[PDB]
Amino acid sequence: GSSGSSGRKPPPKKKMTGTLETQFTCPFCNHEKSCDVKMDRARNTGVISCTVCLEEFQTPITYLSEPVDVYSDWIDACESGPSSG
Numbered sequence: 439g440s441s442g443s444s445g446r447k448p449p450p451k452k453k454m455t456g457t458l459e460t461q462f463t464c465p466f467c468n469h470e471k472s473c474d475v476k477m478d479r480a481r482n483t484g485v486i487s488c489t490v491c492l493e494e495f496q497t498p499i500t501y502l503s504e505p506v507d508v509y510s511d512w513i514d515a516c517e518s519g520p521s522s523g
């Protein structure tokens with residue numbers, strides 16, 4: 439058959455994702471950091487919203503919960519999980 443080989447493999451540049459910035463992608467319109475997560479403790483209910491399509495969602499949260507989790511939930515809640523309240 440065929441073959442050559444060479445080797446050598448430099449390390450990839452450092453690039454991580456800084457979560458917990460009250461910002462997340464919107465699966466509805468998808469316009470990058472364009473959403474705000476409202477963590478209401480008194481009511482223990484996190485409400486998310488968009489800044490392009492004008493959307494909003496509500497979900498039960500707690501002190502331990504994070505502003506990054508609510509985002510994920512909103513996804514499954516839309517693709518399959520109609521919340522009532």
Ligand SMILES: [Zn+2]
Nearest residue numbers: 464467488491
């Ligand atoms: Zn949107």
